[PDB]
Write an enzyme that holds these catalytic residues in place. Structure first.
Site, mmCIF file in Angstrom:
data_model
loop_
_atom_site.group_PDB
_atom_site.id
_atom_site.type_symbol
_atom_site.label_atom_id
_atom_site.label_comp_id
_atom_site.label_asym_id
_atom_site.label_seq_id
_atom_site.Cartn_x
_atom_site.Cartn_y
_atom_site.Cartn_z
ATOM 1 N N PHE B 140 34.927 34.796 48.155
ATOM 2 C CA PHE B 140 35.366 35.650 47.056
ATOM 3 C C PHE B 140 34.635 35.203 45.806
ATOM 4 C CE2 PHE B 140 38.144 38.659 44.970
ATOM 5 C CZ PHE B 140 38.183 38.197 43.659
ATOM 6 N N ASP B 226 28.783 28.075 44.455
ATOM 7 C CA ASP B 226 29.736 28.684 43.533
ATOM 8 C C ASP B 226 30.856 27.681 43.251
ATOM 9 O OD1 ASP B 226 31.693 29.998 42.123
ATOM 10 O OD2 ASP B 226 31.707 31.821 43.369
ATOM 11 N N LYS B 255 35.774 29.713 34.604
ATOM 12 C CA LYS B 255 37.185 29.365 34.464
ATOM 13 C C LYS B 255 37.423 28.190 33.521
ATOM 14 C CE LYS B 255 38.381 31.278 38.877
ATOM 15 N NZ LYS B 255 39.533 32.126 39.237
HETATM 16 C C1 LIG Z 1 34.888 31.100 43.534
HETATM 17 C C2 LIG Z 1 34.982 32.270 42.541
HETATM 18 N N1 LIG Z 1 33.874 32.805 42.034
HETATM 19 C C3 LIG Z 1 33.936 33.824 41.149
HETATM 20 C C4 LIG Z 1 35.135 34.389 40.732
HETATM 21 C C5 LIG Z 1 35.197 35.573 39.744
HETATM 22 O O1 LIG Z 1 35.612 35.077 38.496
HETATM 23 P P1 LIG Z 1 36.124 36.162 37.373
HETATM 24 O O2 LIG Z 1 35.161 37.474 37.418
HETATM 25 O O3 LIG Z 1 37.453 36.582 37.686
HETATM 26 O O4 LIG Z 1 36.124 35.461 36.035
HETATM 27 C C6 LIG Z 1 36.328 33.851 41.252
HETATM 28 C C7 LIG Z 1 37.690 34.443 40.808
HETATM 29 N N2 LIG Z 1 38.784 34.240 41.455
HETATM 30 C C8 LIG Z 1 40.054 34.858 40.974
HETATM 31 C C9 LIG Z 1 40.092 36.174 40.380
HETATM 32 C C10 LIG Z 1 41.649 36.219 39.872
HETATM 33 C C11 LIG Z 1 42.244 37.400 39.938
HETATM 34 O O5 LIG Z 1 42.127 38.176 40.960
HETATM 35 O O6 LIG Z 1 42.964 37.752 38.974
HETATM 36 C C12 LIG Z 1 42.327 35.223 41.055
HETATM 37 C C13 LIG Z 1 41.265 34.382 41.345
HETATM 38 C C14 LIG Z 1 41.430 33.442 42.518
HETATM 39 C C15 LIG Z 1 41.002 32.204 42.532
HETATM 40 F F1 LIG Z 1 40.342 31.608 41.441
HETATM 41 F F2 LIG Z 1 41.216 31.471 43.667
HETATM 42 C C16 LIG Z 1 42.103 34.001 43.742
HETATM 43 F F3 LIG Z 1 43.482 34.318 43.620
HETATM 44 F F4 LIG Z 1 41.407 35.166 43.996
HETATM 45 F F5 LIG Z 1 41.984 33.042 44.733
HETATM 46 C C17 LIG Z 1 36.232 32.774 42.157
HETATM 47 O O7 LIG Z 1 37.421 32.225 42.717
#
Ligand SMILES: Cc1ncc(COP(=O)(O)O)c(/C=N/[C@H]2C[C@@H](C(=O)O)C[C@H]2C(=C(F)F)C(F)(F)F)c1O
Ligand SMILES: Cc1ncc(COP(=O)(O)O)c(/C=N/[C@H]2C[C@@H](C(=O)O)C[C@H]2C(=C(F)F)C(F)(F)F)c1O
Ligand SMILES: O=C(O)CNC(CO)(CO)CO
Ligand SMILES: O=C(O)CNC(CO)(CO)CO
Lengths: 402, 402
Positions: B140, B226, B255
């Protein structure tokens, strides 16, 4: 730490994806910027129309300082107490059912493409994955792989493919081409800027936006209006589409939505489109955070309370009137609406838009070229007529010094 | 304005792309959050690891307040005096030649894909537009059309196509599959998370990252790591890849890079990759703005000065040790590194990860499920051992109350 030191250090440690104008800014407020040596300048770029409200507007600053001591980010996994107040405010302000908050302009555009496709598959009934979105040549809506795939500018897309399928491109300001494109029942949307900013402030003919809205309604196609730079009083209205009393199906906002203090963007539309996306199917870590929402609420209030749209309207007429007093020998065209304007330079090999902007900087005014013959003039909307007239003098003194 | 009022108002005026846990937060500091009725909670989500430094860390706040009175956004058309200082700091801190600043995590990922393709065409010599990027199933990296095209999660991509070509997907934690995939000389990069966060904190076998680096070097393929959620002390190191002394070709940060006060992200790599992108060929309105840079510099200093990586290391061992004391009847697995952890729930129809998190909220601890059987535990890295032990009591009291 001098301006030359600042240039060299960015050159060593930073990517070379930009070639900025050689000026090293340290401080800004209202319509003015100061460089590291203390020299004072008029800002005629407004950070690509993100500081419509002037640099560091005190009302937006105080909203930031009040909220940053309280709570800045819970993520969307929980509720915060600010997001809704912003959502109620902006949806009533623009008269749409709902808003989906994002951070940057390109994120709002990607969101709009995803709403259009999802609506096409789940409401219009297009077979999965035949949905198309039509764009106008010269469009610019950001730098993702998707956004450059709809671009006709080789500097955006060359070397960065393969490209996103399902995008069709037609000439801008061309209703017969749109009518021809919308014969395909698999088209889900047409996305277009009411004035093409990056293409050189290209203003379509009167009636274009009314014809777009009619054709989209007739063919059951979503009309997505990208107002990320034309919106929020820059052209003399809340939305550039307000000039023709046209209501798009999706509206994109950004840049000035925060006053330049925070990346905030927004996608506005009604329930029959917005609710095609279900929980877990779209989001963003920072989208809708409490700090940006407080900033956005204040930056919208500043636009409304200080009547900047009518100020931008009345001063843009003045600006364009004076600019055409320049000799046609040297300025081939003046274009714009409200306080989003451009002049086209008769680019001989004596001189070019870059050298003009170098000399404008020397005379205390910051602007920047877009294709070596086009110079944009877009000062903050809090500028006053007397300040505007001083700036025109600096433009006159510069153009005629060649 | 109660919690129920807050829920209803978001439901009316906001998109339904999320289904948050029913808690309405107004205030946060350190490891604690307070809702609108004043109840106090432990934060075991850290806003998806963006508030590694604790909510509203005073050092990062003061950096924001000092800079917001000075200058927040010039755009990249001119230089500001902050950006380079940040660039010099972060590139020396991680030992890469250059950084390219962006705003959100997905923007940094799109940037990495564009660098990989451009490098593939202009350095490796792949014919235009045959370049491939390989990803691991379960990845993701955001919600753009490009990011969901590499996803294997139907909730990310279903209804949103057609999809970006040129992405290959292989199993995660599988070196023979990567070796098979890299036989194609048109592959330009492999992009992978050192620990898959959204897939449920999936930690690859020891040696996986060393084998990835070897295979990428042997086949002249870029290794993009990443670290947007595994980086910046969350797993007990500056980079999760530091555990195996592996140097990726491109590193993505986001983040926690801001402490949760500003969307800041970064792409780090050396000159032979970074300089494949020329001026005008990539950018962002807010990327590299002075306000976010000041915030990022402070948020990096907080990580270094308070030694949070070693704090996260030593407390994560404690956390995982206690969590396995839960009965195997009920908790089928404990996973994690440093302070990024998860437990898997034996999902009967008596109960599920959602009901657990509802009861955890009732007992004063905020966490949230990821697939109805997985619960993430990831508190801010400023937590103390005694505070951590109180939290484990709340988890114990909750799991055993079923
Ligand atoms: C490894 C990695 N690379 C890029 C991005 C994009 O970053 P972004 O464009 O959002 O700034 C992410 C973002 N992950 C998010 C999005 C947030 C949400 O869905 O609200 C929840 C979240 C999340 C985390 F961190 F673990 C989970 F619940 F999906 F599992 C990321 O994990
Ligand atoms: C109509 C519209 N829709 C979406 C976006 C994406 O918004 P974003 O992802 O950046 O937040 C933009 C952004 N346009 C930028 C990007 C900025 C830069 O290249 O630095 C310069 C700038 C610009 C303006 F505004 F006119 C110009 F010089 F390209 F011409 C936009 O104009
Ligand atoms: O093949 C082309 O010339 C262009 N194709 C696309 C734009 O029309 C992608 O860039 C299709 O989405
Ligand atoms: O065709 C598929 O199954 C998937 N194709 C892509 C992923 O491998 C796009 O989603 C190619 O980029």
């Amino acid at each position: 730490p001098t301006s030359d030191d600042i240039f060299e250090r960015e050159y060593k440690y930073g990517a070379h994806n930009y070639h900025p104008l050689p000026v090293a800014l340290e401080r800004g407020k209202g319509i003015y910027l100061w460089d590291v040596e203390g020299r004072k300048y008029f800002d005629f770029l407004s950070s690509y129309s993100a500081v419509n409200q002037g640099h560091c507007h005190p009302k937006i600053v105080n909203a930031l300082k009040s909220q940053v001591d309280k709570l800045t980010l819970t993520s969307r996994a929980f509720y915060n107490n600010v997001l809704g107040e912003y959502e109620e405010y902006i949806t009533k302000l623009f008269n749409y059912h709902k808003v989906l908050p994002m951070n940057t302009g390109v994120e709002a555009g990607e969101t709009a493409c995803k709403l259009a496709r999802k609506w096409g598959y789940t409401v219009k009934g297009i077979q999965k994955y035949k949905a198309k979105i039509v764009f106008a040549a010269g469009n610019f809506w950001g730098r993702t792989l998707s956004a450059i795939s709809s671009s006709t500018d080789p500097t955006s897309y060359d070397g960065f493919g393969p490209f996103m399928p399902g995008f069709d491109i037609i000439p801008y300001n061309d209703l017969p081409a749109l009518e021809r494109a919308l014969q395909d029942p698999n088209v889900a949307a047409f996305m277009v800027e009411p004035i093409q900013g990056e293409a050189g402030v290209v203003v379509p003919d009167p009636g274009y936006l009314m014809g777009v809205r009619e054709l989209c309604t007739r063919h059951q196609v979503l009309f997505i209006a990208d107002e990320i730079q034309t919106g929020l009083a820059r052209t003399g209205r809340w939305l550039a589409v307000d000039y023709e009393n046209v209501r798009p199906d999706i509206v994109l906002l950004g840049k000035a939505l925060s006053g330049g203090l925070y990346p905030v963007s927004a996608v506005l539309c009604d329930d029959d489109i917005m609710l095609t996306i279900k929980p877990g199917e779209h989001g963003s870590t920072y989208g809708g955070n409490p700090l940006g929402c407080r900033v956005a609420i204040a930056a919208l209030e500043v636009l409304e309370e200080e009547n900047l749209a009518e100020n931008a309207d009345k001063l843009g007429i003045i600006l364009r009137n004076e600019l055409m007093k320049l000799p046609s020998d040297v300025v081939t065209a003046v274009r714009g609406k409200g306080l989003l304007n451009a002049i086209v330079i008769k680019e001989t090999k004596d001189w070019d838009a870059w050298k003009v902007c170098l000399r404008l900087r020397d005379n205390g005014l910051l602007a920047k070229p877009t294709h070596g013959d086009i110079i944009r003039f877009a000062p903050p909307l809090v500028i006053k007529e007397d300040e505007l007239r001083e700036s025109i003098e600096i433009i006159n003194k510069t153009i005629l010094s060649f």
